Amino acid sequence: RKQVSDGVAHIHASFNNTIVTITDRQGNALGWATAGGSGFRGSRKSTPFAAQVAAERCADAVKEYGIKNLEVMVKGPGPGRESTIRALNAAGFRITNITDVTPIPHXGCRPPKKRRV
Partner RNA sequence: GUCUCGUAGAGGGGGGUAGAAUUCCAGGUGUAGCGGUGAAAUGCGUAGAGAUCUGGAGGAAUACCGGUGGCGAAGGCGGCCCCCUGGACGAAGACUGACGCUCAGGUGCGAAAGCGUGGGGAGCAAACAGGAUUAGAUACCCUGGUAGUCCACGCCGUAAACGAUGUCGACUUGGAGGUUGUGCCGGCGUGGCUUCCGGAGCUAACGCGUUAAGUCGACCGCCUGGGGAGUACGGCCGCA
Partner RNA sequence: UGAUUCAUGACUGGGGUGAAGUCGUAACAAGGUAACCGUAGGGGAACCUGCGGUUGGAUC
Half-sphere exposure of 7 (CA within 13 A, CB side): 27
Q: Which does 27 bind (CB under 5 to 8 A by kind): RNA, other proteins, none?
A: RNA
Helices of type H across 1-82: 48-61
Region binding RNA by CB under 7 A among candidate stretches 33-41, 79-87, 89-97: 33-41
Which 47-106 positions form the footprint of other proteins (CB under 8 A)? 76-77, 82, 85-86, 89, 95-102, 104-106
Could you give phi then psi for residue 64, rounded to 5 degrees? Answer: -70, -30
Using the minimum distance from each CB to RNA, give the nearer residue, 19 or 67: 19
* 2 Rama class: left (phi>0) / alpha (psi -120 to 50) / beta: beta
Q: Quick one: which of 47, 94, 99, 105 contacts RNA (CB under 7 A)?
A: 105
Give the total residue count for the chain: 117
List of residues contacting other proteins (CB under 8 A): 76-77, 82, 85-86, 89, 95-102, 104-106, 110-115
